[PDB]
Design a protein around this ligand. Structure first.
Ligand SMILES: N[C@@H](Cc1cc(I)c(Oc2ccc(O)c(I)c2)c(I)c1)C(=O)O
Ligand SMILES: N[C@@H](Cc1cc(I)c(Oc2ccc(O)c(I)c2)c(I)c1)C(=O)O
Ligand SMILES: C[C@]12CCC(=O)C[C@@H]1CC[C@@H]1[C@@H]2CC[C@]2(C)[C@@H](O)CC[C@@H]12
Length: 248
């Protein structure tokens, strides 16, 4: 189908972080690389979003809003996928040049968060998530977080989102044969998507605090990276911007 072709086509390619694996794994060096990777990934996310069906129909302000609020969840989701299809979730495959092993997970001073990220990665396994489900779920994540007071034009966003959820449906009901597994599959996926929010929330908090102490730990934050984390992220940690959960 058309929709499925677009998603597969606009799917971003490999992206390096530019990490110098020749230097010892120090906290400053590791995170500074993750921020750079984030900055770079942000560029591919914006283009990816613009090329998304119906995205260019939202108010220009909302387009930048939804992107600045869910960039974390998206990247984290895609990261788990790579880790799953690249190294069987054994390690966090952030980038071909920035892979995290047990040691690095500790050195990054955010081991626990990595554990959850890996749990998310492994999820792609037991749930036998197909490439089609992944693409659709990831896109649906773009419309998974907005301000409590709605966007510039909620009416459209609600319909755009609704139209993306129906896609997930068609996808889910494009191979099934029974009414049981089909209705259950939707439950499993919607749950998987919701499990992403909690993780992104911890990373949002961590990066925020890291930015504030950036100069005290010698960690560098790219331009756009520091501008979003100091303006958009705070809105989420303060409760002004909240994620959209399928379940309670
Ligand atoms: N020119 C591109 C799209 C493109 C459009 C815009 I407005 C951009 O501005 C920013 C700057 C910082 C941010 O955090 C965000 I989100 C967006 C960028 I960077 C790229 C294309 O045509 O694919
Ligand atoms: N289901 C179709 C693709 C299809 C996907 C989506 I997201 C749609 O949502 C809207 C709604 C209002 C808009 O202005 C725009 I632009 C898109 C529609 I309408 C159709 C296919 O598979 O060919
Ligand atoms: C989104 C990124 C970078 C892109 C990716 O593959 C997932 C990964 C998850 C951890 C993020 C990192 C970007 C930089 C952050 C936000 C650090 O400041 C702390 C947590 C890091």
């Amino acid at each position: 189908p058309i929709f499925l072709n677009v998603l597969e086509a606009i799917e971003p390619g490999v992206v390096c972080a530019g990490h110098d694996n020749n230097q010892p794994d120090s906290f400053a060096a590791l995170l500074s690389s993750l921020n750079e990777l984030g900055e770079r990934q942000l560029v591919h996310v914006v283009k990816w979003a613009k090329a998304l069906p119906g995205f260019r129909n939202l108010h220009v302000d909302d387009q930048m809003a939804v992107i600045q609020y869910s960039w974390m969840g998206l990247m984290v989701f895609a990261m788990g996928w790579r880790s799953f299809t690249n190294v069987n979730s054994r390690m966090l495959y952030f980038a071909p040049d920035l892979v995290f092993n047990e040691y690095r997970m500790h050195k990054s001073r955010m081991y626990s968060q990595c554990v959850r990220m890996r749990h998310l990665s492994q999820e792609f396994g037991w749930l036998q998530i197909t490439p089609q489900e992944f693409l659709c779920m990831k896109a649906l994540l773009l419309f998974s977080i907005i301000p409590v007071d709605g966007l510039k034009n909620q009416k459209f966003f609600d319909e755009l989102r609704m139209n993306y959820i129906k896609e997930l449906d068609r996808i889910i009901a494009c191979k099934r044969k029974n009414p049981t597994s089909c209705s259950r599959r939707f439950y499993q996926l919607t749950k998987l998507l919701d499990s992403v929010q909690p993780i992104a929330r911890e990373l949002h908090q961590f990066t925020f605090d890291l930015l504030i102490k950036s100069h005290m730990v010698s960690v560098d934050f790219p331009e756009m990276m520091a501008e979003i984390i100091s303006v958009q992220v705070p809105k989420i940690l303060s409760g002004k911007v909240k994620p959209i959960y399928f379940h309670t």
